[PDB]
Design an enzyme around this catalytic site. Structure first.
Site, PDB file in Angstrom:
ATOM      1  N   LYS A   1      59.496 -42.060  -8.990  1.00 38.10           N
ATOM      2  CA  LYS A   1      58.717 -41.880  -7.755  1.00 38.10           C
ATOM      3  C   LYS A   1      59.570 -41.613  -6.500  1.00 38.10           C
ATOM      4  CE  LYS A   1      54.095 -43.498  -9.019  1.00 38.10           C
ATOM      5  NZ  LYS A   1      53.864 -44.584 -10.014  1.00 38.10           N
TER       6      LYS A   1
ATOM      7  N   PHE B   1      50.567 -50.425 -16.244  1.00 34.58           N
ATOM      8  CA  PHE B   1      50.481 -48.993 -16.066  1.00 34.58           C
ATOM      9  C   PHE B   1      51.887 -48.424 -16.131  1.00 34.58           C
ATOM     10  CE2 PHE B   1      48.714 -44.977 -14.918  1.00 34.58           C
ATOM     11  CZ  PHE B   1      49.742 -44.325 -14.224  1.00 34.58           C
TER      12      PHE B   1
ATOM     13  N   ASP C   1      60.049 -52.296 -15.295  1.00 33.62           N
ATOM     14  CA  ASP C   1      59.539 -51.033 -14.774  1.00 33.62           C
ATOM     15  C   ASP C   1      59.419 -51.148 -13.244  1.00 33.62           C
ATOM     16  OD1 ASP C   1      58.216 -48.724 -14.060  1.00 33.62           O
ATOM     17  OD2 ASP C   1      56.702 -48.817 -15.665  1.00 33.62           O
TER      18      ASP C   1
HETATM   19  C1  LIG Z   1      53.605 -44.287 -11.352  1.00 29.13           C
HETATM   20  C2  LIG Z   1      54.198 -45.160 -12.418  1.00 29.13           C
HETATM   21  C3  LIG Z   1      54.743 -44.660 -13.599  1.00 29.13           C
HETATM   22  C4  LIG Z   1      54.712 -43.195 -14.005  1.00 29.13           C
HETATM   23  O1  LIG Z   1      55.098 -42.239 -13.060  1.00 29.13           O
HETATM   24  P1  LIG Z   1      54.746 -40.663 -13.295  1.00 29.13           P
HETATM   25  O2  LIG Z   1      55.877 -39.948 -12.621  1.00 29.13           O
HETATM   26  O3  LIG Z   1      53.403 -40.491 -12.600  1.00 29.13           O
HETATM   27  O4  LIG Z   1      54.716 -40.352 -14.807  1.00 29.13           O
HETATM   28  C5  LIG Z   1      55.299 -45.571 -14.512  1.00 29.13           C
HETATM   29  N1  LIG Z   1      55.334 -46.931 -14.242  1.00 29.13           N
HETATM   30  C6  LIG Z   1      54.796 -47.429 -13.080  1.00 29.13           C
HETATM   31  C7  LIG Z   1      54.842 -48.905 -12.848  1.00 29.13           C
HETATM   32  C8  LIG Z   1      54.216 -46.540 -12.155  1.00 29.13           C
HETATM   33  O5  LIG Z   1      53.658 -46.988 -10.983  1.00 29.13           O
END
Ligand SMILES: *Cc1c(COP(=O)(O)O)cnc(C)c1O
Ligand SMILES: *Cc1c(COP(=O)(O)O)cnc(C)c1O
Lengths: 404, 404
Positions: free
Chosen positions: B257, B142, B228
């Site tokens: 985040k 994700f 990530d």
């Molecule tokens: C939440 C998340 C994202 C994307 O964050 P947004 O600010 O909601 O676009 C990307 N990679 C991971 C692993 C995430 O948990």
């Protein structure tokens, strides 16, 4: 002492990616139409952060809304409900007269959402075969810098070295109705996405009747008209939406930039139920989308535009700006264009003389603007500017231009 | 009187897109580990807005940073320099030990930027022919909901009805070193993007040695390791980065985040010069990226993590959490997993009993969590939680589970 401007440039060069191309000025404070650099020099802002501070820098109504909410709640994500989002949704939908809004954070995110909506509507309502749906764009278009956005760009600087590219995006000339009519012969086209005035292309204003023709053609061929009003919307051109000039209703409207008066990244996708509800629960979301802090600042930002009648002021003052600029010699300024307070001049660029050098001298003389091209300078002051301040700015522009 | 929870749910149903799948609770206030709904009921937060409020809701130091800068300057765009960004850049680069950082707004924007970096490095440094560059992803991944992000997903709810899809994105199983080795035999592969722990997939922790093996393979084959850490980073798993558990240094690290403590959308791409500087001036930038308001809150957000030793806290308390969760009967709860305070439980799902049902009852007992799947429940409280607070939450979890 504190950092000089050169100190600030140098530290970014060391620790920051070199992906931007800024005019060398180092700002530390802003209020209304004015910016101050680290040496204390004062400037007229004639860029408005690419039309994101329509309301002026640090507008007290918008500041107060942020400071009030920040003490209560800033983010739950979309895992839970917050109490503010619905209040913002009812407000914005009734203002622009669409059934629904889908909140996002950045402009490109709103454009991505519009493409997904168009595709999903294409397959589930229009009945196009999966996955053959097309979206048509105009040459010169700009809607951000994701992989998908640059896949529709005609600007080599945005796309070269960054492919392979997203399939299903076609390109036709802007301001060209016969070309749209020809492209819409393909039943697999779901949407046409277009700016009512192309900002990044150099404030390219289409001929009268263009937008009525686009609406007519799209309705005729069962294609969604997506109007990207992220730069042109929100009083900038002298109306709530630039499409209001021809009284046409797009199927999807995109808003961003000045939706927050510069205080927070907030963008929005507006459309009716038959398009919006093609996306089902869980199929599209973001972490920060619709957060209570952003919503409070967007409510206040929109109320300011309404209360201060900034659309009317932009309409009145823009014609003054254009008419005054048109008085400059033709061997120097070859064209003046725009609507409201979104304007540009085209200069007779030589090898020794260009838009960048003009903008550097402008800066030296107390006014901040930036080129879109070697021969095009964009002028976009905040919409709270008064006539006397505009005429003072015009004097700076004249003096600077004629000093070469 | 004011809106009830049902009022708030109904207003969003009428005026907002139906794109989220929220647990029905209507929050108006958050402080630290606690959330209050519009009826004044108090909840333990065990989701932290998907690990975006690691520092707790409305942390006074980050709130103060926002309130202080909002009165000075909030946005210039990258057409001009602001005085704050460079200070942020020097601070964050020295903290994580990379040459440079590229500032963006949302997590998915950081991911898109990393894909663009990997491709341009692929063409200009590795010598791949345009446009044959591939990026490899792990099944279950994700990273957001742009067209590009959903083009790498194995979740049908993310991609169904939204095609066609971005070419050059390949998928292999997670936690599978032989599969990676086989993919990297193709010299046109530029990068492998992976989460050190998969959050949305259900807190899937890969076997010890996986990350060390990924690093080795990428280096051998001249492929960029993109980690990530948007959910896993910033003390959530008990280190600055989950990757620190195996001393692994990715080529590109993504943060987002909790980078702002939930007060502003701020994301970051960190890498060294030979990768970062493949993007030239004017080739990639967004309106709000690197704005001074966001940078002020990001510096404060990071300082909180360091100053309050939240990684250390998350590690000790996470050990307690998992220990207590494993005491639950092995036929009701089938698996417990996580690192630090990113944890999950798998339940013996039946026709009549699922994770959603458990989370509704949890809510009724004053604790907020959300399912990741019909049989998987994620627990992620802010990292400021003290031991006794956690133990109370544990008894609420205990009581609730056994109350069915
Ligand atoms: C939440 C998340 C994202 C994307 O964050 P947004 O600010 O909601 O676009 C990307 N990679 C991971 C692993 C995430 O948990
Ligand atoms: C600036 C702009 C965008 C992109 O907005 P970001 O917030 O920079 O992602 C999209 N469309 C138009 C017309 C714009 O001017």
């Amino acid at each position: 002492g504190p950092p000089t401007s050169d100190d600030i440039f140098e530290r970014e060069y060391k620790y920051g990616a070199h992906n931007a191309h800024p005019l060398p000025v180092a700002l530390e404070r802003g209020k209304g139409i004015y910016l101050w650099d680290v040496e204390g020099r004062k400037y007229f802002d004639f860029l408005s952060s690419i039309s994101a501070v329509n309301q002026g820098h640090c507008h007290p109504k918008i500041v107060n809304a942020l400071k009030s909410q920040v003490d209560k709640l800033t983010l739950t994500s979309r895992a839970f409900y917050n109490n503010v989002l619905g209040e913002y949704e009812e407000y914005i939908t009734k203002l622009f007269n669409y059934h629904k809004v889908l909140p996002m954070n950045t402009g490109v995110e709103a454009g991505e959402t519009a493409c997904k909506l168009a595709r999903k509507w294409g397959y589930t309502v229009k009945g196009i075969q999966k996955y053959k749906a097309k979206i048509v764009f105009a040459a010169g278009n700009f809607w951000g810098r994701t992989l998908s956005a640059i896949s529709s760009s005609t600007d080599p600087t945005s796309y070269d070295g960054f492919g392979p590219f997203m399939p299903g995006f076609d390109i036709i000339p802007y301001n060209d109705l016969p070309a749209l009519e020809r492209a819409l012969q393909d039943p697999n086209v779901a949407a046409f996405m277009v700016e009512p005035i192309q900002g990044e292309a150099g404030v390219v204003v289409p001929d009268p009747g263009y937008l009525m023709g686009v609406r007519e053609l799209c309705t005729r061929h069962q294609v969604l008209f997506i109007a990207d009003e992220i730069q042109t919307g929100l009083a900038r051109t002298g109306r709530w939406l630039a499409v209001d000039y021809e009284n046409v209703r797009p199927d999807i409207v995109l808003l961003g930039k000045a939706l927050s008066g510069g205080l927070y990244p907030v963008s929005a996708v507006l459309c009716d139920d038959d398009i919006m509800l093609t996306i089902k629960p869980g199929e599209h979301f973001s972490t920060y989308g619709g957060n209570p802090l952003g919503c409070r600042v967007a409510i206040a930002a929109l109320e300011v535009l309404e209360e201060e009648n900034l659309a009317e002021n932009a309409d009145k003052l823009g014609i003054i700006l254009r008419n005054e600029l048109m008085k400059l010699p033709s061997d120097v300024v070859t064209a003046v264009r725009g609507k409201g307070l979104l304007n540009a001049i085209v200069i007779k660029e030589t090898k020794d003389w260009d838009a960048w050098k003009v903008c550097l001298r402008l800066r030296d003389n107390g006014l901040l603007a930036k080129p879109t091209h070697g021969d095009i300078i964009r002028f976009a002051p905040p919409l709270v500017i008064k006539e006397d301040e505009l005429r003072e700015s015009i004097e700076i522009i004249n003096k600077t231009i004629l000093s070469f």
